[PDB]
């Protein structure tokens, strides 16, 4: 004579299996920005949260659960034990140390490799068929580490890479031209960070090449100093870190953009971090951002951008640098 | 001979006035959760942020701007000067002062009052026709303060009140009954906080009154202790604060839900705080939560809930309490 | 040498297995309204359309495909062969004869039964684990037919039932009370059509019983004639058909609302048609609308509404009528 | 003691002026596709419908209104009298004449001019500050007619033009290359119809010029017959009309995309029809599609695409053709 049984006649016993489950590992500033953006876009029917800080983890789960009335994601769970992540379609890794003022992303590598040695084997134990989307920095090296530790085929291990760098670039381009970032096109490839490569030849509005219109585009002799736009992209994370201490909102939206292509099988092209040995002249097994076709099987194809020999030389050097960092990691 | 002029032929001298602008005052955790929720629901054509901490304010603005590609809000602005808020349709106040240094809370409430003495006159000078939505705690007193300082008619000064408390209640009801919060209906009215009034008579699923089905509902004599659920709602913000240090996500989602009713003129009913002198037996200038019809002119109507004499007595006690605190403030 | 291969390096060959596929059978007025509503709510990663009219089917598929840029459903497929429907999560049946002006949904029965004799065995052959959502009229009898022909457990065979009748009722109530339909609650149960049952006791705003406030609600002696609102609901399909020839938009939105609860596992309560024997006093195998909990396994629970002796008598006579038709059908 | 007055205490006399109103003129298949697309994107707080067929018009309004529960547009109105359209921000014209047996093509165009001679003065009388968006065919000529009759500045009169042709082109490109239409870029300019101009130089994926990679792109001898893709675009409407009798869904989505840029002030670039005299080598008052920056003041800027002499020559011949049809017309 419980109220529930007076009210509700049960017709079916429910061994609930999740169908569109996403996990976020690390519920820091980045992790929670990814979680709220994914929740507000209705990409998942179950969201699992993992962290090592147990009280913070339960507090973040509860705060999200209290907003359930306003969401269309019926189940949010969390735990330190990765059993809560079982049968995820997509596992997003945002755990780790972050930059202080003046610190390069590459200075984070030793701390975050050691964290990944713990995280990745636990992920693959409960979700052996998931896609891994790596956001923790340095993202290109850590996508390689996730790949090696997981044993996954390379199509299922993705780094957020330069998706956000390109979005920042398009925003800054739009502010200068007086149009929305959506209508500005421009690709930043290579390392997410100081050594990223702007592809000046591809920048356009409505298929009109900016460089064809303004041949000094991207050079030091440019009176409008468009080269500084890329410098603002490179510097932007450092400037936000100095002002507010960290970055979170933009990366959350960028990660949810990637999750949407994966979860809906959109086969959109994004500049994300993938194993590009054998492409673009690279001979080592390094992860760099190039335009990739992203869908329900991860990265299925890569677009072959025509680079100048200078643009190609920048990528070739990055690959050497990153491969040099990778070579001496113990995992 | 600039690139913009090579690319773009300007046909129209642009004198921009925003049509659907929202301002958030305070870029703490609550203010930024409101802003991200509003941005992801496409409620505004311009978002303005204001705070007194200039560096954090610029950093939060830039972080949102870098996500523009992923949004459909084309203009995000910020500044210490309220000229950036001009012509807002809706202004959301989340600013407040921190209150734990061996200090009386009567002095604290007074410090938040002094904060509002600066904010509200600046808001009304640049947006004299806006709706004001007060989220800062203690929300019922500060909604009153905003109303007195602004000189706005009462339909245009709204407190977030018990909107989130009711949502938390519906979530917990649904966890107990095995259905989504959307399908559990239940109203927490009165003072936001420890003395809020759960309206047991109205709680229902599918129009079925739970109290008619379970006449013990809301008493201590209930073997199932549904009264404890209201206690859980009252305690939830404290529990989240103890675990993660503050709350943000649920309040942000709840505020964006109120903003949606306002901006789209939906005339949905929400439990929010309104000046209820002359209603529900109240004779003083106090704000408490009742079900209100919310649209483009703010609160246009109040639903008259049939309360028990006990429930009505709770509301009148709160009203006496609030009026006693307010009388010893200064404007 | 081909352009595609100069442009794109393929990194893996994968066979497409859809994860969130929906099929619509019948691409007439109702089917296409369902299709556009589902596409604009992003509920599917693949939409399959089936009809017997081959030119119309290809024309509707092509017209949706040309709008791909504006959608986030990457694959729209169609054909007369049910192989295109393989592995659907949800199959929506909108095929069959409709009401000519004045005619009861009941004279359609045998013609639409004959159609289901071909559709349903083809559906279950290619999607043995799907949920079936029957919209074709008379919907309560045809949901029974689909259940008998399919051999599916009753939780996976759903009729659109009174979801739309209740939505129409809430709209009309809101018009009279000056509030959005979202905030008006009221349940129409039983037969979709002339013999549906309004549950006056459950009608409410903000948990305030209208009947408690207005005792003649639902009686002939009511000076406001609220009973005429239920007659407007019963008559609405007839009035729209007389004006424009058929109805489509409202049913499409109602079906997409049901599809959303299923695909996202929301466990929302909807008034839909389910096999009711053993509940509400019914003795025979009939389908009628009661509040059902709807999720990824279909209908898992039923809300037990407390009915008046008169309301219960109406349901029992409907059950008798329906069983009277079913007894006479031939598959 | 009416029920409404028992239930609701009115606080405010409603001088309701709509803030985000859209009107659709013509409720045939195209007009209703525009309406449902606009409603499901939450672009308007009021939708007004107008037609000359009073019965069909009332039936379509009622059918949309019955779906209010599932929408977030609180007011849908309709009528033969243009008073229902007052204070629209945007008026979409989809009305047109039905061709006759043995009716010269020019006599038909004159019958659409005669229609516009009635519609446009009524629109501008009740919404003198609106934007006009013309969809009726032949769209370049009728946008000119609307501009002349309205007396509006050219920034406020927009033709749907080649927006949908370019979307069809991108869909077809994407089918051939294996990526989403979103990631394929390509512009069809000029006259909507058989003489539109595909801008081969601008076609790209990820900023990679297909013409640079495949320099015979767009020629007759191209073993990949990419020229045939344009021919498919110009023919696609006729193919769909032959199969299903009319086209509606893609144009509806296309129009709602334009309405979104206007209503949200996005300043996105779209290929739409604008009064181009003085640009692209054109000397007469004609409307042609070029990439335009679209926002709350209509078309504020035009992108200057670098065309080949051949493409440029095609545009000028269209302008000559159109100007010759117009000077014939009686206003
Ligand atoms: N790819 C990109 O564009 C960007 C990446 N990041 C990076 O994301 C990472 C996190 O940044 P924030 O969220 O700001 O830091 P945070 O300090 O707010 O949170 C980091 C979380 O990682 C958790 N964590 C640490 N070890 C863990 C473990 N073994 N297992 C599970 N969780 C663990 C921590 O408990 C903490 O809650 C950093 O590497 C940051 O550099 C930050 C912004 C943009
Ligand atoms: N009503 C509700 O349901 C809840 C309301 N809150 C309240 O919201 C308020 C803010 O909470 P948090 O964002 O976590 O605090 P916080 O400390 O993170 O940020 C508060 C912001 O207010 C700013 N501020 C102080 N003086 C200002 C002034 N003159 N002008 C403009 N800004 C000023 C501060 O610079 C700070 O950025 C608090 O009063 C909190 O109790 C907390 C969550 C839910
Ligand atoms: N449950 C509700 O509230 C509502 C239900 N309806 C019903 O929906 C059903 C469809 O109505 P409309 O779309 O207006 O009719 P319609 O005539 O426009 O389309 C019916 C489609 O069914 C197709 N069809 C016939 N046999 C088929 C078969 N073996 N396999 C596949 N497709 C087949 C037809 O070729 C046609 O395209 C009717 O029974 C109608 O009464 C009408 C509106 C509301
Ligand atoms: N520009 C584009 O890309 C596309 C535009 N169209 C065109 O849109 C227009 C409508 O096409 P459909 O909806 O399929 O035609 P339809 O025949 O279904 O509807 C035309 C509507 O206009 C109404 N109408 C006639 N005179 C009127 C007047 N003085 N005032 C108000 N309404 C009036 C009619 O009563 C009718 O309801 C046509 O010109 C069509 O060729 C269709 C294909 C794509
Ligand atoms: O973690 C950071 O803030 C640095 C970074 O990758 C970014 O925001 O671009
Ligand atoms: O007390 C606080 O700071 C938070 C609060 O009002 C809530 O989340 O209910």
Residue numbers in the entry:
A (entry chain C), B (entry chain D), C (entry chain B), D (entry chain A): 1 to 331
Which sentences did the original study use to describe this structure?
L-LDH is allosterically inhibited by its substrate, pyruvate. In order to test whether structural similarity could explain the allosteric inhibition, L-LDH purified from rabbit muscle was co-crystallized with oxaloacetate and NADH, or malonate, respectively. The structures were solved by X-ray crystallography followed by molecular replacement, and refined at 1.87 and 1.58 Å resolution, respectively (refinement statistics in Table 1). L-LDH forms a tetramer and a complete tetramer occupies the asymmetric unit for both crystals.
